[PDB]
Amino acid sequence: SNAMSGESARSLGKGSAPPGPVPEGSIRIYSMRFCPFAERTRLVLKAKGIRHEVININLKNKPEWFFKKNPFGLVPVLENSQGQLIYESAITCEYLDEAYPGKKLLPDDPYEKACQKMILELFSKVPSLVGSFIRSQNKEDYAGLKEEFRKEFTKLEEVLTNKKTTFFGGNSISMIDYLIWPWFERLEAMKLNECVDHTPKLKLWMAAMKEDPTVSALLTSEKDWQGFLELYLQNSPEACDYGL
Amino acid sequence: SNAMSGESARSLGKGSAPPGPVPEGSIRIYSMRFCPFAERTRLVLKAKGIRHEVININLKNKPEWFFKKNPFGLVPVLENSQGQLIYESAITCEYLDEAYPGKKLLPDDPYEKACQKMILELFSKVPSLVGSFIRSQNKEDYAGLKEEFRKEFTKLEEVLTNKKTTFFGGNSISMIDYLIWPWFERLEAMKLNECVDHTPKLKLWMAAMKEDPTVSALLTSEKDWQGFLELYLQNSPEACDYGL
Numbered sequence: 395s396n397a398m399s400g401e402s403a404r405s406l407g408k409g410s411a412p413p414g415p416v417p418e419g420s421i422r423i424y425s426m427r428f429c430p431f432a433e434r435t436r437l438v439l440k441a442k443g444i445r446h447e448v449i450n451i452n453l454k455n456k457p458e459w460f461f462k463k464n465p466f467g468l469v470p471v472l473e474n475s476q477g478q479l480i481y482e483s484a485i486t487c488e489y490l491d492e493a494y495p496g497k498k499l500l501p502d503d504p505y506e507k508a509c510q511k512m513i514l515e516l517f518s519k520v521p522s523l524v525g526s527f528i529r530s531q532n533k534e535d536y537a538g539l540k541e542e543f544r545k546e547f548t549k550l551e552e553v554l555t556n557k558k559t560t561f562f563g564g565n566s567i568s569m570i571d572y573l574i575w576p577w578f579e580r581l582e583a584m585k586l587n588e589c590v591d592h593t594p595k596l597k598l599w600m601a602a603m604k605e606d607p608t609v610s611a612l613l614t615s616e617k618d619w620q621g622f623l624e625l626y627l628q629n630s631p632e633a634c635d636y637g638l
Numbered sequence: 639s640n641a642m643s644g645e646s647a648r649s650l651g652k653g654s655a656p657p658g659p660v661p662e663g664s665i666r667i668y669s670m671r672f673c674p675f676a677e678r679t680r681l682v683l684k685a686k687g688i689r690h691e692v693i694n695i696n697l698k699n700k701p702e703w704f705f706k707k708n709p710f711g712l713v714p715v716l717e718n719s720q721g722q723l724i725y726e727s728a729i730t731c732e733y734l735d736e737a738y739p740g741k742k743l744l745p746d747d748p749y750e751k752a753c754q755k756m757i758l759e760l761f762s763k764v765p766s767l768v769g770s771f772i773r774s775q776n777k778e779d780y781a782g783l784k785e786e787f788r789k790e791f792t793k794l795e796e797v798l799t800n801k802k803t804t805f806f807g808g809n810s811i812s813m814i815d816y817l818i819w820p821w822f823e824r825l826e827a828m829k830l831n832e833c834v835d836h837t838p839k840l841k842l843w844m845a846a847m848k849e850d851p852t853v854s855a856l857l858t859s860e861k862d863w864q865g866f867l868e869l870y871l872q873n874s875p876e877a878c879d880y881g882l
């Protein structure tokens with residue numbers, strides 16, 4: 395398969411030298427191959443066809459210089475040729491939509507853009523629920539997190555039911571679908587397919603997202619993801635480079 | 639004193655009827671007189687000179703009809719004559735700056751807009767620290783929390799230093815200053831004034847904000863706040879209306 399978004403780049407760890415300046419006409423993304431938050435920014439970079447370079451960070455063996463890019467020391471981080479630094483996944487995405495030509499991913503109408511960010515707040519419990527699920531050390535907690543996923547998914551299902559469209563922003567794919575897609579991409583890999591059983595609109599939305607040229611171009615092995623997760627839970631510095 | 643921002647509107651609780659329709663040409667804000675998140679929105683409405691009505695909600699005796707305005711049941715909530723509903727304090731603020739004429743609070747530049755949202759993220763722990771401090775029961779935790787307020791304020795001081803500006807978005811007041819002001823406004827009332835004396839620019843920024851005409855128009859009694867606070871921690875249905 396063709397690597398088209400930093401998929402083969404080995405992560406930089408403690409003791410690595412800081413990368414050189416960003417070439418003019420290019421925007422660098424500090425990312426990690428399996429990070430869903432960094433995936434929002436990679437999805438936007440492709441959807442808008444922006445020329446970019448990807449530097450992967452080893453999140454379980456962080457380079458000291460990475461804290462100079464983001465004091466929070468989290469991915470994604472964007473760095474342009476001017477040395478301007480933008481972090482936080484939703485800030486990176488909005489910035490890209492605003493600063494670069496190509497398909498406009500966010501509506502200009504202030505109310506419609508406000509609906510997209512309100513939908514994102516309705517989604518906000520899903521990443522914490524994913525965090526709890528992966529860490530569950532008992533069959534009981536595990537089964538109860540599955541019912542909890544149904545309750546959150548239903549709230550997303552209602553948005554589609556009211557808007558009467560396939561995607562969260564309308565007839566065509568927009569910013570909001572790309573911002574929430576990274577967690578839904580892994581439901582099969584997490585054995586959470588059953589949690590979309592009573593949400594038909596969300597099930598149809600998932601199939602439509604998997605057909606999108608941007609979404610499809612970034613899909614990787616579920617086994618690479620699962621192997622990464624095992625190593626990540628173990629606090630391994632080999633997690634981020636799993637499968638390379 | 640002249641009440642220009644919902645200071646004299648008795649809060650609506652269980653058993654009260656929801657307000658009438660929003661007059662055309664006006665916008666309604668569902669608020670609470672001492673809520674720092676809804677105060678963000680009230681500051682923006684005043685600064686941009688927007689015609690608006692303030693409806694106060696009794697947060698310790700919440701009408702079930704209010705969950706139809708915001709499913710999270712939180713203030714602020716904006717409601718217009720078209721029936722559109724906007725919630726989440728930073729969402730209501732950006733919406734108002736984009737939809738209405740008057741003073742522009744957000745900068746035109748995409749990167750400078752990004753910076754404002756990044757500074758908002760650096761400030762993000764302060765509301766939770768304020769919540770913990772007001773619930774303190776021992777001397778050790780009270781001292782420990784002051785050390786944490788100091789460290790977070792140092793992060794804000796670094797911004798004003800690196801920028802070489804009086805305000806967070808430049809040499810003039812902008813969106814970012816109004817978004818964070820509601821917590822600094824209460825430091826004297828919480829006896830936390832000493833937590834900013836190791837951050838010279840922060841202390842000067844607070845003095846400058848105090849002088850701002852928009853800030854001064856929304857100023858309330860330090861004792862009304864403290865009295866509201868005691869009742870609020872007791873979950874009293876009379877908290878929201880203290881002073882009225």
Ligand SMILES: *CCC(=O)N(Cc1cc(C)no1)c1nc(-c2ccccc2)cs1
Pocket residue numbers: 426428429430431432453469470521522524525526528529626627
């Ligand atoms: C870029 C983010 C990332 O790679 N992380 C860090 C993170 C995010 C959250 C919610 N917690 O840490 C990843 N974290 C996981 C994860 C979360 C919780 C438990 C195990 C694994 C996968 S990627």
Ligand SMILES: *CCC(=O)N(Cc1cc(C)no1)c1nc(-c2ccccc2)cs1
Pocket residue numbers: 670672673674675676697712713714765766768769770772773870
């Ligand atoms: C509009 C919201 C509001 O009035 N809150 C709710 C809230 C927000 C946070 C971070 N915690 O509660 C208020 N809550 C307080 C409060 C609660 C607990 C400790 C301190 C202060 C005052 S207003």
